């Protein structure tokens, strides 16, 4: 744990770049300048409860807007189905990693605020409150299913556990032994706030979007066909498109065979376009043949068609 | 390009399936821009005239014709659908679902064999036919 904490400290100190010049725009000052926001003074527990309620309501609105009445979200932000999902319903229920990540963030906030309201009610002692906060910030992965939706988050989790190994084995010296009584939650709270800093813009962008209002030859052939058929008389293009496509195929075959290709009745602008197309496709063909041969000779996994084609090209 | 005929509404599709009596109707549900659909349509054009005697190919855009999305579970970026005398033919490719190809094979001979087997099983009377190959493994080594 010490070694990995040092590793992450060194990584932070080495990947560090000096901050870039800004214009100093403050979000909350802008919010206060509008009519939709108003200021007051409130207890932290009250705003914690209010934020939990607002998060639950907003998640309910997002769920109900998709008409996914078969999924129920409890007050602990644990989303569960109520019936066997149809394939159409199962596809409709694919909310993505962003929604689940936001839901688990709101669940962690619910956990912290619920511990604080539990202390405020008087059921548990302040020492119990601090120890519970330490446990919450050291066991986010166990208490909350965060790692699946965002894999990088797992790293943060290990940090917290490492920090526990840093604190406990210093806290539990002398008369104090192993026990559930150690409350020191600065490190994990710091780590999860720093994770929240990084993931805030992602969830904001997702919510804004949700609440708004290889094959070079084929593409080359399609693009040259579109360009030619745009510069084409409307009344004549019924079969001339097929004729010029046959001409393109014949030109490609003729280049592949080292045989002269000179259509006498073909006008010179169309002929020059076909020559350019054949040149581009031949360059791509040669390059991809060489690349595939290098891949096969190196030992990459390939199927029969690729090898057969490569052999032909080569 | 896409010289294969396209169907622009559900009406075109549902009389195209009933238009052919001695030929297998092939419908590609997807989008031209979709690369996978591009590979399959190139393969189909490579064999469009080879199977003219006993098969026909039509291209249907999902955005243009979205009525078959729910009934045919058209949730993949691309599907290939086989009909004969108004009856769908399921093909046992070994991929788990027998209703649609759902993938783009580069070899045109594989598609030729698949459509030939579908025709043989449809004319004989079996609604479900077995692919003469296993596509569970990509056979890459």
């Amino acid at each position: 744990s010490y070694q990995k904490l040092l590793k992450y400290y060194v990584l932070n100190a080495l990947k560090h770049r000096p901050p870039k010049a800004q214009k100093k725009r403050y979000l909350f000052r802008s919010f206060k300048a509008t009519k939709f926001f108003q200021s007051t003074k409130l207890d932290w527990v009250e705003v914690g409860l209010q934020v939990c309620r607002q998060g639950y309501n907003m998640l309910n609105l997002l769920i109900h807007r998709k008409n996914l009445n078969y999924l129920h979200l409890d007050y602990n932000f644990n989303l569960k189905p109520v019936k066997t999902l149809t394939t159409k319903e199962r596809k409709k229920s694919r909310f993505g990693n962003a929604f689940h990540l936001c839901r688990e963030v709101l669940r962690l906030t619910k956990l912290v605020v619920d511990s604080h309201v539990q202390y405020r009610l008087g059921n548990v002692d302040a020492f119990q409150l601090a120890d519970g906060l330490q446990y919450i910030f050291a066991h986010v992965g166990q208490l909350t299913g965060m790692y699946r939706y965002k894999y990088k988050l797992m790293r943060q989790i290990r940090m917290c556990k490492d920090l526990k190994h840093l604190i406990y084995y210093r806290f539990n010296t002398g008369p104090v032994g192993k026990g559930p009584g150690c409350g020191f939650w600065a490190a994990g709270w710091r780590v999860w706030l720093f994770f929240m800093r990084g993931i805030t813009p992602l969830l904001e962008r997702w919510l804004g979007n949700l609440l708004a209002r290889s094959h070079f030859d084929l593409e080359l052939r399609a693009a040259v066909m579109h360009d030619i058929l745009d510069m084409m008389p409307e009344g004549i293009k019924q079969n001339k498109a097929r004729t010029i496509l046959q001409h393109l195929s014949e030109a490609w075959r003729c280049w592949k065979a080292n045989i002269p290709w000179k259509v006498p009745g073909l006008p010179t602008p169309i002929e020059n376009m076909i020559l350019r197309y054949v040149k581009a496709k031949a360059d791509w063909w040669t390059n991809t043949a060489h690349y595939n041969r290098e891949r096969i000779r190196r030992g990459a996994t390939v199927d029969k068609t690729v090898c057969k084609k490569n052999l032909g090209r080569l | 390009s896409y010289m294969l005929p396209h169907l622009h509404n559900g009406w075109q599709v549902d009389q195209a399936i009933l238009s052919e009596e001695d030929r297998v109707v092939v419908i590609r549900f997807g989008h031209d821009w979709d690369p996978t659909c591009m590979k399959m349509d190139e393969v189909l054009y490579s064999i469009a005239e080879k199977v003219k005697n006993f098969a026909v190919i039509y291209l249907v855009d999902i955005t243009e014709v979205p009525d078959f999305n729910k009934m045919y579970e058209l949730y993949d970026p691309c599907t290939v659908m086989f009909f004969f005398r108004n009856k769908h033919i399921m093909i046992d490719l070994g991929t788990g679902n027998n209703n649609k190809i759902n993938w783009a094979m580069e070899d045109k001979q594989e598609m030729v064999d698949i459509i030939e087997t579908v025709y043989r099983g449809a004319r004989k009377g079996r609604g479900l036919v077995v692919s003469p190959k296993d596509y569970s493994t990509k056979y890459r080594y």
């Binding site: 399609a222 579109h226 058929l229 498109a241 | 005929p5 031209d32």
Partner: peptide
């Protein structure tokens, strides 16, 4: 016919 699909492809790509 072919041009109708070419315009759709170009617009979508």
């Amino acid at each position: 016919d072919i041009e109708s699909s070419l315009k759709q492809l170009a617009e979508r790509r």
